[PDB]
Structure formats: structure tokens, C-alpha cells
Amino acid sequence: IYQEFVNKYSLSKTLRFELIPQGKTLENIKARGLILDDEKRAKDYKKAKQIIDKYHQFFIEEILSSVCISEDLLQNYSDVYFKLKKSDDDNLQKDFKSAKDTIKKQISEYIKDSEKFKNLFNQNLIDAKKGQESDLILWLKQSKDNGIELFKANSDITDIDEALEIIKSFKGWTTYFKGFHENRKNVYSSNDIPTSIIYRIVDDNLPKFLENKAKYESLKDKAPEAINYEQIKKDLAEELTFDIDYKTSEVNQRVFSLDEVFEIANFNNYLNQSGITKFNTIIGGKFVNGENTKRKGINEYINLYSQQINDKTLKKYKMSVLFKQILSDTESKKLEDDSDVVTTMQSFYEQIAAFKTVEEKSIKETLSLLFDDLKAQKLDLSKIYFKNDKSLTDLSQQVFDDYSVIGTAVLEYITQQIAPKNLDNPSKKEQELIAKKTEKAKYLSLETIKLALEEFNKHRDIDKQCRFEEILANFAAIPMIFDEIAQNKDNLAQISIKYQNQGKKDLLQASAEDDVKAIKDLLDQTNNLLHKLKIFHISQSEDKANILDKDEHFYLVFEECYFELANIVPLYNKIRNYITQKPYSDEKFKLNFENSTLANGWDKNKEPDNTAILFIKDDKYYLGVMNKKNNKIFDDKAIKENKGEGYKKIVYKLLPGANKMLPKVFFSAKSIKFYNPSEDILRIRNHSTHTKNGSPQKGYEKFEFNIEDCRKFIDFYKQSISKHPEWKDFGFRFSDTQRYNSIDEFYREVENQGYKLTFENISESYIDSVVNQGKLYLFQIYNKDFSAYSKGRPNLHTLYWKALFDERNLQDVVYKLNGEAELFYRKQSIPKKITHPAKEAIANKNKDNPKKESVFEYDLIKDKRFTEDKFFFHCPITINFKSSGANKFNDEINLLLKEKANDVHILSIDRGERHLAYYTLVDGKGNIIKQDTFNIIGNDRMKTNYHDKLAAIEKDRDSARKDWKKINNIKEMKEGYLSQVVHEIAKLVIEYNAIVVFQDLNVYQKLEKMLIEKLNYLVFKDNEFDKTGGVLRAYQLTAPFETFKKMGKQTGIIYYVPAGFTSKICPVTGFVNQLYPKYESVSKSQEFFSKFDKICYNLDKGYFEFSFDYKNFGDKAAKGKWTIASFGSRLINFRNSDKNHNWDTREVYPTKELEKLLKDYSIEYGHGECIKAAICGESDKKFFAKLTSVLNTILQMRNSKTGTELDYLISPVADVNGNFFDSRQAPKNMPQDADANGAYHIGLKGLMLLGRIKNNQEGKKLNLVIKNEEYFEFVQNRNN
């Protein structure tokens, strides 16, 4: 079991906390403006990062414009490509990587050797050196102040006349960008890492250009057609100036042909963005800004040719568009603003004030006066067709308001005579309902609606039934909806002036819902005034035969004015989720306090550069931000003075990067003479002889690794550390150098043990003294458990943080504090209101609660997370720091489970909406142990039930459209359930020696994200400290998360299984709905019954049978005889989705429906032998198309829906001794409810994975996939 499976690999968390200002640190900071002047160095940090980045683009458009020509090796890459992708052999794949390597270094050589490359990625870009300012103003102040590249119109920054101020503000702050330029240096990286522009061109466009000239050589096999070199390129000449040709050379401004493309050696023209925007007009085709028509390209002419010629497979020869170059800008050539929310409403009032109709009038003044003529059929009163989806119901709800009133009479005129049942396929047909009938996607007109209502008027009671003229008064005041939306514009004069702030947010909080009455109801006149006039517009819905017989009289203003007044259905999608956004309206911006390199590390020697140390005061943790002006105020001088009592002080001591550090002191100019490196050793470090991949010192030669030419370099290191002034404090204990093997085994142990944390007591009166002027900023690290009113269980981001500083920890550090983190200042989101006030009754909101009120002495403000300008401190850690890893992990536990066999259980899952899951803890030998749901959860005493809260909000899909004003915020709701599930999954695994499985989904998937990310480190809040699950020694069960798409057939102990074919199955044998009868033609249903062994009524037992060996079938020939029956009282389906039709499960019995047939056809059964031949002897539409819904029911087992009335699973087979399985007559070790037998055999799928691992051998590839001829094979031989 999992008794040694702790401390396996290392991680990285990010514990967050909150900083409470102590003393009057809040009075020091708010005095001058030390955070007032912040958000001008966390806002201008990103304003400058995207004015530094277009010059980081303008560079790439002049180091890929006319340069970087990797000629004729493209041919050398074309050779290794087509043969390897067609024949995956070993020898070319080596040559493939050789071709892959060589293009990059050829390209990257000129890339890394520019005029502007070197002085871009350090101090020499922004501000470098006295006398000038370096390369960043060399483009703006020099190149683009004289010349004009005005992208300040196309930006957030106003102009360039002011933009100098954003540039010069970082003077000296140019060590602060040192993570931002730590990913630009993977843009130019010629390594196998996919952010690069060199992985963009070599391996991500070049095998997408070899598959381009594997088709253009096959294009001009019959492609002479009307392609723009034949007809027109006057437009595409300024657009295709084509400055260079790179097979030999070119004239400056010559226009090329359709042959420069697809050359193997012209791939050195397809590098940058401006050059793929000229590759994707030729295949793209673009516009002219002058009221013109689209001027096409190549794949917009094959659109005009594979419809001319009838070659349907000629669309295999379209040219795939290339990708985008990394980091390239794009050219042109919902919201949050409380002004645009008041301006788009003003634009909806203004857009109706100038809408152009046909007669120089409005769209409402055109469709309204025509209704007076169209009501008398003055327009085309016979072919007024709309998109036939809901206008049959909406017109039935237009003036009559009926679901079965007017729109249910067109069935006797539309789609009932594709094949009449009189001598033309009356019973013998191939089910010609798609071939002989195509009346599904036809449109219905007003004359066809009037003619549909003629049979309903002929079926009407009164003789004054509905004609096409009398019911025409229903669309009279539809043009009057513009008069009512005009009533929502007088109050906007007190609304638009009441929206004079840029970032207003007058409704996004929790208090201003009544202010939206001027917008959630004045936008209602366009909510329903256009929502009722949708019958006068022709939609786009057809089953391949859409004609509809459209008219032209009223349809001219219908598509125009219905489109001219579409400022509501677009405008009401503009207040669509602006209202339902909960307050986390944060900014979370960085604090500096003058220190760019703030808090990067805690180690003592660098402390006036970081200017932050922590303070323990007997488990009340504080943060001290030393002010930069006086940052020496915690040296050893004051520690020798103020050795008193009060705040303990953190002494941190650190050796980071033993690759980068043990050659940083020991071979460097200021201090090499103190160390005195020997003769043979100084040979090694130059040429990197001690490494296997290490970079040698420049101007030398990478020699070979050697055995003693590395171990001596440890023998240098084992003595040279003890000579250091500070690093002899640690007292390392290395092993013998016979036992080392490389330098990783040494650089790990100088980074394992290179961490010690100690404590120096400080007199409390001194700290109180220094805070009062401003010479220290002290802040308390704070969450739930760092307030005084806790009782019980602390957060798992407060069992770690309280165990960094443990004296059981710092024996052998498994929680290494880390650095680099920042301080964040969220402003006030929620303005303070209580709304659950003091000492009064407030109602509960649970249902299984033995209480119904609450008293609440103290107030509860709506959001005290967000009424307070809380500070925010981050804090990385490193769980299992001394024991890193994360390799060979998925193959470890298989060797673990083998030795500890016969002792392991299985978890499970299913999904649904009728449940949310249903776990099932299964044994290893059949008879299962436990089984429950994930609806009863939180089972200590409170028992909340998430299962019903989803359907509680699914019923309320209206008010975001109706009064345009709903608050549910369901999008984090449902994911928020998924968190609570994890622990109850997590508890069972250790407690019952279990393994876990899941479903696949290659948001029901996101719960598998959250057990790979959360069996990284599994520590129980109730478990004892430094015991097998405690905060130091806890469970690492997953190797961590990379992607969904390589989640494996294992991701730890979380084995997987294939989806589907669980939710239908009898348990004790395992037969599935594998037939699929649907009665296409007549005697193919006789082909069903003719293959049986015998079909008899078991008169000795009181039910029918259908005995069949499955051999005589061919869709999926799962063998074995099958003996289904009629004894269960199986339920028919509801035939659901019907508001007035048969949507109820009228239960049809099996045994009392074949004696309906025995009465209809008197084929007896008293002899007790084969009765197959006579039942085959009948052929009728009545005999078989009614036998469908019976034979859809003798088998079907999931049932009983619309009510969840213990929907239940009924066995046909009666395996060994004649008893069935009804899943409510079912014992506890068998499935029990709706989605229960789905999650059972998944475990029996899971036991099959264990069946291979149990008899596993030394085969390093282990077969963890399940064949359908195994899952249907294993479970049918369990008892035997």
C-alpha cells in the first residue's frame, strides 16, 4: 500500500496572502503617494512593454525582409521529407533531423548578427549610457520622428510627441523587465521549443510547403482556367509590387507570375508577415475601400471550377493557407464602459432617426404604411414566406395565442404525398421518405398559411372562419413599436448626462439594479417589437431544396427595414453579460516602493537590495518592507545592538543554481587568486571537459567528457567551498567521489543542502521606533487562520506556510521558501452595504438544515473581501525540495502494484444531469464494497446537495432578455461544484487501497484536470503532522499535468478505459443492445427472425423468449447464444419533447403484447418446439412497423424517465439459476439507480487492466488499452 510512496518528486506552488498595514505604515504610504504613484509603474510597465514590442517587431521586418536565405538545403529537406512520411524508416529520420538542424543554424546565424540585435535585450535598448539614449529611441526619436510611421493612431498611446515620457521613465528600471525578456529569448531560440520563429519556419511552414508543392505539380494537370494571370492584375500590382526574387535576383518593381510560388528554392521569400499578407491575397483575395466588389484569388477560382466540372473530388487540390509568423502585428489598411452602454443606447435612438428607406424615409415609415395595403392583400398575399422554424407557432401566438390554433393546418397541403399508399409503395418500399420526399426544408407562405388555415377553417366550428383578410389585423401595431421605443428616449436626457464618466460601472456592482429600469425596459420596446415582426423575413433553412416561392412586393422592405432596425437585436446583445458579472472587478497590480528587484530572495547577503524580510512573532507572521532610502537598517550592526525580544527575524541562506554558481565564485577575476585553482583542473573548466553537454569557455574547443576529468573538478569543489567566507556555514556532508557519476549528482547536493534557515531575535521597541518615521514598512500576513476567531481546520495554504518555519521542517527542508514574488494592491470593488444586518432574523438557504433562521449580533457586509483596499503578497514554495524527480512515474506504480498485489481496490465515475456523478468502489474479485453518489456530499453534519442547484437555475433562462436584467452568473457556478467532489474521491483511495479511473471526453472533463493537478500533493488538514499523510510527508500520486491529449492510458494510479457501452447492460452476463432493427424494407425484418434457433412462449414459466446465437450477424459479431425474454415489465420511452403530445411513458408490457399478436395470428405454442417458420410467414406494413416499437422495447432497459422515479435496469438473461436482475430488487453489491450500471463495469474494465499488470513480465511496453472483444469477453466468464 502507500506507506513508502511519499517524497517522490518536487513541485511549485504559489501561496497567496493578504497584508494588513501595522503601526501607521498605512499613514506613511498614503502620505506622499507611494501607491498613488504606483499604477504608473505597473500600468506603464505594460504600456512600455507594448511600445517596446513593435520595435521588437520592426526589427523582425528588417531581418527577414531581404535576408536569411537558406538556399538548396530546402531541396535537401524535400528529399528527407516525402520518403520519411511515406516510409517511416530509421536511416532517413536521422538525415531528417540533420536536415532539420542545418536550416536553423543557417537561418539563425544572420538573425543573431544584426546591427540592432545585441543592443536590444539588455540595458542597451531603453537607456544605457551617458551622452545618448540607446537603441529604443534610435527608432522613435531618430528613425520615426523624422520619418512618420504613425501607428499611434492604431494604438492606445496618443501620439509620439508625448510618448517619450513613457520611454524615459524606466531610467535605471531596466533590471525590472528581466522576466519579460526571458521569453523574447525563446522567440529567437533555435532549439526544439515551439514559441520560436525558427520552429515557425523550419518545422511548421516547410512541411506545410512541401505538401504545397506536392499539389501544385499536380495542379497543372488540367488547371488552365480563369486564373488572375489570364484576366486581371491591374488591381493586384500596387498590391503585388514584389520587390525581390530569390532564385537569382530581380528588378525592383516587376510583377511576378503564378510560378514564383511553390518552388523549392523560393521558400526563402516566404518568411515575414508582410509577405504572407502578400501570400494570402493571392490565395485570399481582398477588397477596395471604394464601394467595390471582392476581387478574388486562387482558391476563390477553384470554388468556381469544381462546380463547373462535375469532379467532386477536385476539392482535394486546394492550397492550405500558411500559419502566422510569431509576434506579428495585424494591420487593417460586450463592453465595460458606462458611456458606450449609454452611447450604444443613444446610437440605437440615433440610428432610427436617420435610417434610409426606399422612398427617402425611415424603415418604420415604410413597413408601417404598407401594412394598410398588405392587410387587404394589396401586396403578394399568396407567397409571403418566412423562415419556417417558429412562425407556425409564433403566428399561432401572434393574434390568436394558440399552440394548436392556426399554425396546425398546413399538414394537409405540405409533406404527406411523397409516396401515396395506394399501389405505389403502400407496404413494399425501401423507406423512401428521404429520396421520394424532400418537403422538410421548404418554406411556407401566407397563402399557404391561409390555405393551411383553410382546412382548419373548414374544420372550424363557425362559418365565419379565418380567411387571409380578417386575421390580418394582428400585424397592424407592429409598426407602432417604434412609437413605444421612442418613449424610452425622453428619460435618457436624465440618463446620458448621468453617464459622464469613462469607466462608470453604475450597474455591475450589487446595488444599482433599479437604475437599469431606463435601459432594461426601454430596450424592451426593441426586445419584442422586433421579436414579433420576425414573420415578415425570409430565413435560411432548407433540406437541399429551398425555393419557397418568394415574392418581391413586400419582401423588399421586409429584409431592408427589418435589417435597418436591427440596432436592438445587436444592441440587446450589448447589455447581454454586462449585467451578470460578479464583483471581482480587480486590478491586482504590482507594488514596488522604489525597488525594481523587490523581494527576489531572502538571503542575508543581498538584503538591502531585495528590501524585504519576514518576521515571526509566535505565529503572527509579518512582512517588513525596508524603505530603499534607508535600506541598511537590518544589518548585523542593529542585530548586535537590538538583540532583545519581540519580532523574530528570518535569516535565509541559499545556494541557487549550482551550474551557475560554483563556477561563478571559483573561477572569477576578483577572487580566483584566493582560491588558487590547480593546473589540470583549470584545463577542464575552459573546455568543459567535466560535462557531457556543457558550454566550454569561449574561444576554446568542446572536448570529450572523461571520468577523472570531472571527479577532480568535484575534488576542487569539495575543498574550495570551505575556503569561502560565508558558504562554510552549511556544513555539507558529501559522499566519496568513487560514488559520483557526473556533475548533476554534485550540483544537486550543493543545491539540496545549500539551504538553511535561522532566526535572530529583535527587540520589539526598536521596530516600533523605526516604523513611526517611515524607515520600515511592516505588514501582517493574513487569511482566515491568521485572525483570532478561528476554531477548527486551516486552509491547505496555511498548513504549508505555517510549516515553512517549523523546527521539524528545517531539520531536513521539504518546504523551501522561494523568491521572485510580488506585492499587489486591489482597490475597492464593492461599496460597503450590509443587507444582512445586526441582531435580526435572517433566513437560511439550505434544505437539510436543522435550523431556519439566524441572529447575527455583528453585521455581515455584502462583500468584505471587496470593501477593503487589501494588499496582496505571493509566496512560491517548493514541496519536496530535497527530493526532486517527476520521471518514470507512470511506470513506477506498476512495479509497486505487482509486489503488493491481491490488496487493491478500484474507484469509478459516470456523468449526467440526473446525477452529477456516481462513484463505485469495486473489489478485485467481483463482490463490490461501497457505492454512493456525488449528490450527498459534505457528510459531517451539514449535507448540502449540489445536485438540485443546477436544475434550480436551468429553469430561469428569461430575465437576461425579458427585462434584460438577470443575475445568476452560472459560468463559474458549475465548475465550482467540481472542487468539493475531489476530497471525497481523495479520501477513499488511501483508506481502501484504491486506484482511480475516469471518463475521457477527448466541463465534464475538467474534473480530470482537477485530480491530476490535485494528487500532485495530497495532505489532509486533519491528519497528524509529519506522519504518512502529514504536511511534510504527504501523498504524491500523479506525475503532473501537461495536456489533455497525452493524459495517457495512465497518469499515475489513474488508469483509463475506453468510453461508452456501459449505460445499457445487464450486469451478471453483459449483453448489449447490439442489434439495431429499424424496418427499412419488409422482408429484411423477416431476415431477423429467420436466423433464430427457436422463438417460443415459455408456457412452463409464463413469458415469451427470443433465443438466438449471435453468429449469424455482421455489424459487430460478438459471439455467444442469447436468450432474451418478456418477463420484466419494461417501460416504453416517453417519446419526449412534446408540450401537448404523447411525452409521457405509457408503459407497454412485453408478454402482454405478443399475445396481442397471438390473438391477431393464432400460431399456437402447446407443442413446445420451434415456432420460427410461421412468424416469418407474414409480410405486412402493419405486422412489422408496429413490431418496431415492440422490438425497441423487449431489449431496452434504461427507462422510466421524466420524474427519475427510481429508473431501473432489468435483466433479460437469468444467468445460472433462473433469477433475473431487476435493479430495484437488487442487493447493495449491484448497481442501484439511474447512472449506476454505467459506473460499474468501468470498474470491471478496470479489473482487466489489473489482470495484465498482475501477470506482467519485463515488457517495458505494457498493453493498457481495452479491446471491445475483451471487455465483451472477460465479463462473460466471471463465475464459470
Partner RNA sequence: AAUUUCUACUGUUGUAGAUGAGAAGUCAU
The nearest distance, CB 579 to DNA, in angstroms, is 15
Determine which residue in the list 39, 506, 785, 932 makes contact with RNA, applying CB under 7 A: 785
CA 293 to chain centre: 39
Q: Are 780 and 621 in contact (CB under 8 A)?
A: yes
The binder of 16, among DNA, RNA, none, by C-beta within 5 to 8 A per type, is RNA
Q: Rounded to the nearest 5°, which phi and psi values hold at 759? A: -140, 135
Binding of residue 728 to DNA (CB under 7 A): no
Residue 488 vs 600, nearer CB to DNA? 600
Q: Provide the minimum distance between the beta carbon of 33 and DNA in the complex, in angstroms, as a whole number.
A: 21
Enumerate residues 317-336 that contact RNA by CB under 7 A. 323-328
Name the minimum Å distance from CB 1038 to DNA: 15
Rg over alpha carbons for the chain, rounded to the nearest Å, is 39
Q: Which of residues 3-22 bind DNA (CB under 7 A)?
A: 12
Q: Given candidates 252, 310, 693, 1140, which one binds DNA under the rule CB under 7 A?
A: 693
- Per the DSSP assignment, residues forming a β-bridge with 207 are none
Quote the CA–CA distance of 881 and 1279 in Å, as a whole number.
50
Residue 323 CA to chain centroid, in angstroms?
A: 22
Cβ pair 377, 450 in contact under 8 A: no
Q: Which one, of 1027, 1051, 1091, lies nearest residue 6 by Cα?
A: 1027
Asked if residue 706 binds DNA (CB under 7 A), the reply is no
- Asked if 864 is part of the footprint of RNA (rule: CB under 7 A), the reply reads yes
User: For DNA, which stretch binds (CB under 7 A), given 61-69, 189-197, 956-964, 1190-1198?
Assistant: 189-197
Alpha-carbon gap, residue 992 to 985, rounded angstroms: 11
What residues from 804 to 833 belong to the interface with RNA (CB under 7 A)?
Answer: 822, 826
Shortest reach from residue 678's CB to DNA, in Å:
16
- Residue 172 interacting entry, from RNA, DNA, none, C-beta within 5 to 8 Å by type: DNA
Which residue matches cell numbers 506603464?
44
Is residue 940 within the footprint of RNA (CB under 7 A)? Answer: yes
Beta strands in 730-877 (DSSP E): 755-761, 777-782, 823-825, 871-876
Task: Tell me the DSSP string of 97-145.
Answer: HHHHHHHHHHHHHHHTS-TTTGGGSSHHHHS-STTS--TTHIIIIIIHH
Distinct helix (H) and strand (E) counts, the chain = 41, 16
Residue 657 binds which of RNA, DNA, none (CB < 5-8 A, kind-dependent): DNA
> Does 1105 participate in binding RNA (rule CB under 7 A)?
no
Applying the rule CB under 7 A, the residues between 683 and 742 that interact with RNA are: none
- Write down the least CB distance from residue 329 to RNA, Å: 9
Select from RNA, DNA, none the partner in contact with residue 787, using the beta carbon and a kind-dependent cut-off of 5 to 8 Å. Answer: RNA
User: Which of 340, 609, 822, 984: binder of DNA (CB under 7 A)?
Assistant: 609
The binder of RNA chosen from 8, 582, 617, 653 (CB under 7 A)? 582
- What is the spatial distance between Cα 154 and Cα 848, in angstroms, rounded to a whole number? 58
Spatial neighbors of 59 by CB under 8 A, at least 6 apart, are 114, 116, 117, 120
955 binds RNA (CB under 7 A): no
How many chain residues bind RNA (CB under 7 A)?
99
**Interacting residue with RNA among 815, 872, 881, 1089 (CB under 7 A):** 872
Binding marks (x or -) toward DNA, 1039..1058, rule CB under 7 A?
Answer: ---xxxxx------------
Q: Does 191 bind RNA (CB under 7 A)?
A: no
Grid coordinates given for 411? 399538414
CA-closest candidate to residue 295, choices 282, 305, 277: 282
537, 68, 3: which is closest to 325 by C-alpha?
Answer: 68
Residue 858 binds to RNA (criterion: CB under 7 A): yes
606 binds DNA (CB under 7 A): yes
Nearest Cα to Cα of residue 933 among 895, 980, 967, 992: 980
Name the residue nearer to RNA (CB basis): 388 or 944.
944
Q: Which stretch binds DNA (CB under 7 A): 666-674, 857-865, 928-936, 1028-1036?
A: 666-674
CA–CA separation, 993 and 157 (whole Å): 61
From candidates 941, 955, 1139, 1260, binder to RNA by CB under 7 A: 941
Angstrom distance (rounded) from CA 86 to CA 724: 61
Instruction: Write down the H helix ranges in 707-843.
Output: 708-720, 744-747, 749-752, 764-771, 801-804
CB of 15 to RNA, least distance (A): 7
Which is nearer to DNA, 354 or 669 (by Cβ)?
669
| Shortest spacing between CB 733 and DNA, in angstroms | 18
Distance CA 244, CA 255 (A): 10
Stretch that binds DNA, among 351-359, 385-393, 683-691, 1202-1210 (CB under 7 A): 683-691
CA atoms of 373 and 1014, how far apart (whole Å): 70
Q: Contact between 172 and DNA (CB under 7 A)?
A: yes
Q: How many residues bind DNA (CB under 7 A)?
A: 79
Furthest CA-CA distance within the chain: 119
Q: Which of 605, 769, 835, 1188 binds DNA (CB under 7 A)?
A: 605
Position among 550, 870, 914, 1091 found at the interface with RNA (CB under 7 A): 870
Q: 1196 touches which of DNA, RNA, none (CB within 5 to 8 A by kind)?
A: none
C-alpha 132/C-alpha 351 separation (Å) is 54
Which residue of 98, 605, 769, 795 would you call a contact of RNA, by CB under 7 A?
Answer: 795
Q: How far apart are CA 410 and CA 455, in angstroms?
A: 8
Q: 1201, 1219, 1231, 1046: which is closest to 1135 by C-alpha? A: 1201
Which stretch in 21-29, 190-198, 364-372, 439-447 sits in contact with DNA by CB under 7 A? 190-198
Q: What is the DSSP string of 1162-1210?
A: ----TT-S--HHHHHT---HHHHHHHHHHHTTSS--S--TTTT-----B
What separation in angstroms does the CA of 259 have from each of 239, 256, 747, 838, 1142? 18, 8, 57, 82, 66
Residue window 793-822: x/- pattern of binding to DNA, with contact defined by CB under 7 A: -----------------------x-xxx--
Query: DSSP assignment, residue 831?
Result: P
Q: Which is nearer to RNA, 387 or 797 (CB)?
A: 797
Give 220 or 664: the residue with its C-beta nearer to DNA: 664
Find the part of the chain contacting RNA (CB under 7 A) among 591-599, 758-766, 978-986, 1055-1063.
Answer: 978-986
| Rounded Cα gap, residues 177 and 138, in angstroms | 19
- State how far the Cα of 776 lies from the Cα of 627, in Å rounded to an integer: 6
Q: What is the DSSP string of 652-677?
A: EEE---TTTSHHHHTT-TTTHHHH--
Q: Which of 37, 132, 154, 194 contacts RNA by CB under 7 A?
A: 194
The whole-angstrom separation of Cα 823 and Cα 594 is: 13
685 binds, among RNA, DNA, none (CB under 5 to 8 A by kind): DNA
Among 1014, 1064, 1186, 1254, binds RNA (CB under 7 A): 1014
Binding mask 863-902 for DNA (x = CB under 7 A): -------------x-x--------x---------------
Residue 223 binds which entry of DNA, RNA, none, CB below 5-8 Å type-dependent? none
Please, what sign has the CA dihedral across residues 52, 54, 57, 59?
Answer: negative
- Contacting DNA within 121-140 (CB under 7 A): 122-124, 129-130
Per-residue x/- mask for DNA, residues 944 to 983, rule CB under 7 A? ---------------------------x------------
Q: Considering beta carbons, is residue 450 or 604 the nearer one to DNA? A: 604
> Nearer Cβ to DNA, position 352 or 813?
813
**Cα dihedral 1002, 1003, 1008, 1009 in deg (nearest 10):** 100
- Of 608 and 1058, the one with the shorter C-beta distance to RNA is 1058
- In the complex, the smallest distance separating the C-beta of residue 178 from DNA, rounded to whole angstroms, is 6
